[PDB]
Amino acid sequence: KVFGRCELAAAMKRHGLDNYRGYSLGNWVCAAKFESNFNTQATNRNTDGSTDYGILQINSRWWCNDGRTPGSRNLCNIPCSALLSSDITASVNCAKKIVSDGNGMNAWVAWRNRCKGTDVQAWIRGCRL
Ligand code: NA
């Protein structure tokens, strides 16, 4: 599924992502925009042989099982395929553990380089929430 900006804002809020670990809804929408372009089925292979999955490009090295990432953990206890669902619940649950891991949203390199310190409220601007 390819979410609309305000539609994804609403979905993230309904799953309690807004202000989770102190990150405003804008931060999550901006991260999604530049990780997946709001596409739930986005997959990207890393040079290390891990793969990133879904709206928030969660990596098979630590967080999900894809059966082809040697030496890897599955700390969200889910197949990486569940992160490609049109229902964002599995992605949200697992992003909650990632952003709790110690480095906050710096875990998403695209968030650090493209959203951190920017006017992230523009991402939820005009959205009925
Ligand atoms: Na894994």
What is the rounded distance in angstroms from the CA atom of residue 96 to the CA atom of residue 34?
Answer: 18
CATH 2.120.10.80 fits 1-129, yes or no: no
Q: For residue 15, how far is its CA from the centre of ligand 1 (angstroms)?
A: 24
* Resolution as reported, in Å: 1.6
Residue ranges in the chain assigned as alpha helix (H)? 5-14, 25-36, 89-99, 109-114
Tokens of 49: 């042989």
What is the rounded distance in angstroms from the CA atom of residue 122 to the CA atom of residue 48?
Answer: 35
Instruction: Describe the strand order of the beta sheet including 43-45 as a list of residue ranges.
Output: 43-45, 51-53, 58-59
Beta carbons of 80 and 45 less than 8 angstroms apart? no
Asked whether residue 101 is marked as a ligand-binding residue, the answer is yes
Q: Is 35 a catalytic residue?
A: yes
What is the rounded distance in angstroms from the CA atom of residue 39 to the CA atom of residue 123?
Answer: 16
Beta carbons of 128 and 14 less than 8 angstroms apart? no
Q: Which residues pair with 23 in a beta bridge?
A: 20
Q: Where exactly are the structural domains of the chain?
A: 1-129
What is the rounded distance in angstroms from the CA atom of residue 2 to the CA atom of residue 84?
Answer: 11
Tokens of 69: 């990432």
